[PDB]
Design a protein around this ligand. Structure first.
Ligand code: SF4
Length: 393
DNA sequence: AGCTGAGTGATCCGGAGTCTGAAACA
DNA sequence: TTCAGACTCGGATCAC
């Protein structure tokens, strides 16, 4: 029964959280994405020890290097048989921009070899049928996957009852009024808030509190937690004064220009005849097409439209207001000889934390309601990632 | 008692960032 | 003013 009270109090903290920020991050509602499960497995391979934008870029580089011949559609966008028949050198060169490329490429090749010598064709849709316990056991039975990876794959793709704790989640849960930094032990004397490394097996002390909650609740909690950690709780100087839990974050009680490059531009309606070469935008994005201005023009495209959805891990790599830069439209921008359209801001930069540092709360709210973020570029022809043009940031 | 052994504890893999201290000059 | 080396988004070992 005492277990019950703890569970209830945690449920309450979560509810206060998922709501309080819901007035800031807009609508983080569940939206399904296409794609097989092997896409998720390769993605969780790829994002093991690298930042999110770099991992997404490496994944799309893999996708464009070997695209599936093509005309929740659980069909892999990458012809993994080609990678099975490929060589280690070239595939490591494919993700050379990520690091660890030899090691990761070898691990991917070993995983694919294990799969094919197990049951022939490359397929894991049947993981959706077995009980979650045995599926979790078999996924963990692989090499190169710890517990965080399998928990993440299960929760965000197979919709089980799981909670992956990345660095942000552990830091957040140890720094707020939630579980302290002394779960099993008793420090009781530190006299500072240095946040020395406590990203570890704490889950045995946290998972019991999160045994019985809704799946959508856990999905939204994870999504909003990671974006909130990206924007508000950074390892170096959080904008703690501006966090709505300033009256509740335990760390805040201890004490009490070149980053952003924005251009006020106009968005593109979905029925503009000059956009006929732009993949025929799909209807499941709150945000729309954008155009960057300096007779002159340069277009912007949303991420989900650019990739046709079907991104691994249900597309949690990307922010809600995240757009791509068309490489062709950047190399030789189009001359379009348009003022009465609504004016919107682009907030260019290089990552999520870099752009949002130093900003006041109202500016954050504005850029989440009628704002946008872009940190990279994209080529329509080869469907591959490319470095961002230096003409803006 | 004299050999486990459990568990961590460093350390690794590796590009691209940024951040930060020294130097330098006043 | 430079700039250069340190540090920052897990899973294998391997030593203790
Ligand atoms: S109150 Fe400040 S330090 Fe605490 S989580 Fe919010 S932004 Fe971070």
């Amino acid at each position: 029964k005492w277990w019950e009270e703890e569970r209830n109090v945690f449920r309450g903290r979560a509810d206060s959280f998922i709501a309080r920020m819901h007035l800031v991050q807009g609508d983080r509602r569940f939206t399904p994405w296409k794609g097989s499960v092997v896409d998720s497995v390769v993605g969780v391979f790829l994002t093991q020890n690298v930042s999110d934008h770099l991992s997404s870029s490496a994944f799309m580089s893999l996708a464009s290097q070997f695209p599936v011949p093509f005309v929740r559609s659980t069909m892999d966008t990458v012809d993994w048989k080609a990678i099975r028949a490929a060589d280690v050198k070239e595939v490591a060169e494919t993700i050379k921009s990520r690091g660890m490329n030899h090691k990761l490429a070898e691990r991917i090749q070993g995983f694919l070899d294990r799969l094919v010598n197990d049951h022939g064709s490359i397929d894991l849709e049947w993981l959706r049928d077995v009980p979650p316990d045995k599926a979790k056991e078999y996924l963990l039975s692989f090499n190169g996957l710890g517990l965080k990876s399998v928990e993440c794959v299960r929760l965000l793709t197979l919709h089980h009852l799981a909670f992956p704790v990345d660095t942000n989640v552990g830091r957040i849960a140890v720094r707020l009024g939630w579980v302290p930094l002394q779960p099993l032990p008793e420090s009781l004397q530190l006299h500072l808030l240095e946040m020395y490394p406590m990203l570890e097996s704490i889950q045995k002390y946290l998972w019991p509190r999160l045994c019985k909650l809704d799946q959508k609740t856990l999905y939204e909690l994870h999504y909003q937690m990671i974006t909130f950690g990206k924007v508000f709780c950074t390892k170096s100087k959080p904008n703690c004064n501006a966090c709505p839990m300033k009256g509740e974050c335990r760390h805040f009680a201890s004490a009490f220009s070149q980053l952003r490059t924005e251009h006020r531009v106009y968005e593109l309606p979905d029925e503009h005849p000059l956009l006929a070469q732009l993949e025929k935008r799909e209807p499941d994005d709150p945000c729309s097409y954008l155009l960057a201005i300096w007779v002159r023009g340069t277009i912007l495209i949303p991420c989900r439209t650019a990739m046709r959805g079907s991104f691994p891990l249900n597309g949690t790599y990307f922010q809600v207001n995240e757009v791509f830069a068309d490489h062709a439209s950047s190399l030789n921008p189009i001359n379009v000889p348009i003022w009465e359209l609504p004016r919107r801001t682009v907030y260019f930069g290089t990552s999520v934390p870099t752009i949002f540092k130093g900003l006041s709360t109202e500016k954050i709210q504005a850029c989440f309601w009628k704002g946008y973020v872009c940190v990279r570029g994209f080529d329509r022809k080869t469907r591959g990632p490319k470095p961002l043009i230096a003409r803006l940031h």
